[PDB]
Amino acid sequence: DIVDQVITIGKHVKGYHYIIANLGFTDGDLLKIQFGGAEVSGFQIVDY
Amino acid sequence: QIGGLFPRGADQEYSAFRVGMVQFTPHIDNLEVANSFAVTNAFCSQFSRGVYAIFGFYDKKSVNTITSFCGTLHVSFITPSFPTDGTHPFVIQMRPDLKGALLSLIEYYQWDKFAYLYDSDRGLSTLQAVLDSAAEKKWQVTAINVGNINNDKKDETYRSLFQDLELKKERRVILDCERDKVNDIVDQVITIGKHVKGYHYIIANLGFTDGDLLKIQFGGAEVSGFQIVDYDDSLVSKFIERWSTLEEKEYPGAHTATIKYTSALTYDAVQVMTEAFRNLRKQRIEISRRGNAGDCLANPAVPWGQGVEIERALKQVQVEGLSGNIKFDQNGKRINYTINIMELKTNGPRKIGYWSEVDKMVVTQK
Amino acid sequence: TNAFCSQFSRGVYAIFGFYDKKSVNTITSFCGTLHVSFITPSFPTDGTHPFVIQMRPDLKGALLSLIEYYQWDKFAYLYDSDRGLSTLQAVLDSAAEKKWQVTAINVGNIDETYRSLFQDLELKKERRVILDCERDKVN
Ligand SMILES: *[C@@H]1O[C@H](CO)[C@@H](O)[C@H](O)[C@H]1NC(C)=O
């Protein structure tokens, strides 16, 4: 939800940095912020 | 007897067709619109079936087929799709002409430079108009067509396109495309993050409130467009009451409070056909063919004469629809119509003005 | 369409013929559907279309390369609609690519009008002009 709102305000561009503080980081959809340029890092407990 | 041809996927247009069928004998076909073959086949089937008129959609790949066959067999064609280039007979374009409204709007914002993204599948007529008015004004313009490129590579090619518009830093962009294509492009813009302040967009289609604006509304970038159906009308509001009454299980997309401009054009089109035949009955000319139509590919082709009198009827009939004043000229174009000019603020889309053929543009953090 | 179907009923293994920008989609569609082969000297279809053999090569790259050879920075493009706007798209995109000032006019949709037209192209007094049209229109 928050991610959607960030993309809406347009704060997903370069120079912005986000840290997702939950496990199963890839569970949520990253495809929509992936092209924005803002760097996003998180944690994954299950290696595919 | 009449034909109706629907492109796969136009649900709401068929919903408006059905509503217009109840409110006022159709033979329905569902086909790939862009496939010339399916079109020819359907058309000939309708001709053999003995239809007095044909209402349907066409694409930029299929336009010439329809125009040619209708100009040859003198069968009349009613369409919500974009207007043919030049003068073509027996084609009634429900859709008005936007070119002058776009140019007048560009003249309203008084831009010196802009980016034009055109859809090939929509036609390059609009493209022909805008270059000429640019070379006249001292205007600086960059224009490219997005559709030739494959959909899978669309994300990469789009990001390439908008990273190209950052070589000239073009902030102001025009989008001449169907509302669908518009929405895709919009999603990509929101993805790159080019929906922020200082960016300006002009949506070059009649469908401005039809497409979802809620997602770019909060971005800060200003977006303006065109709307052909004012919801501030008594006719439109009565229709909207009806449209909010309807079940979504019967007519797809029909429960919503808003309706896409294409559907409105369909509803208004069956209204026009009905009033045209009624007006032919008031004149008491004979409507009915003498025998089975025969084969559309008959050599040499036999045009039924009464067909011409149909074409005239459809052309001479004038009515009040969701679009405004519905009146046609000799080539089938809309005349002296109302195009509401819309800007998009933070509190939702607003009507800044309107456009008539003879009036031109008329406008009404701590 | 009539001719094509007549040929099909007659049972032809291949069809050699010309087409126009108004007739191209008919041919491409019917040949892609009925898997009959088509051989044409006319301009090449845009994109990938099956069962169409375009005898004519692609000139777009040669034109752009020539414009790069004369190293023009500004020019006038007179295009014929009846030929197709593919080259127009090519030169426009390549205009936006390398900083070109290009004015494109539709000359195909027309004695007095010509004399008006060429005295219109004298506002910037531009000397260099390109003509993308059939040889008749060219003459
Ligand atoms: C527009 O057309 C209608 C007829 O359809 C006419 O009553 C009206 O006068 C026209 N508008 C103007 C400003 O003349």
UniProtKB/Swiss-Prot annotation, chain C:
Describe what upregulates or represses it: Down-regulated in the pyramidal cell layer of CA1 in the hippocampus by global ischemia.
**Top-rank taxon:** Eukaryota
Post-translational modification, as annotated: Palmitoylated. Depalmitoylated upon L-glutamate stimulation.
Location relative to the cell: Cell membrane; Postsynaptic cell membrane; Postsynaptic density membrane
- Anything further noted? The postsynaptic actions of L-glutamate are mediated by a variety of receptors that are named according to their selective agonists. This receptor binds AMPA (quisqualate) > L-glutamate > kainate.
Q: What does this protein do?
A: Ionotropic glutamate receptor that functions as a ligand-gated cation channel, gated by L-glutamate and glutamatergic agonists such as alpha-amino-3-hydroxy-5-methyl-4-isoxazolepropionic acid (AMPA), quisqualic acid, and kainic acid. L-glutamate acts as an excitatory neurotransmitter at many synapses in the central nervous system and plays an important role in fast excitatory synaptic transmission.
Report the sequence similarity comment from the record. Answer: Belongs to the glutamate-gated ion channel (TC 1.A.10.1) family. GRIA2 subfamily.
Name under which the protein is recorded: Glutamate receptor 2
Q: Which organism is it from?
A: Rattus norvegicus
The uppermost taxa in this organism's lineage are: Eukaryota, Metazoa, Chordata, Craniata, Vertebrata
Q: According to the record, which residues of the full protein are present here?
A: 74 to 217 of 883
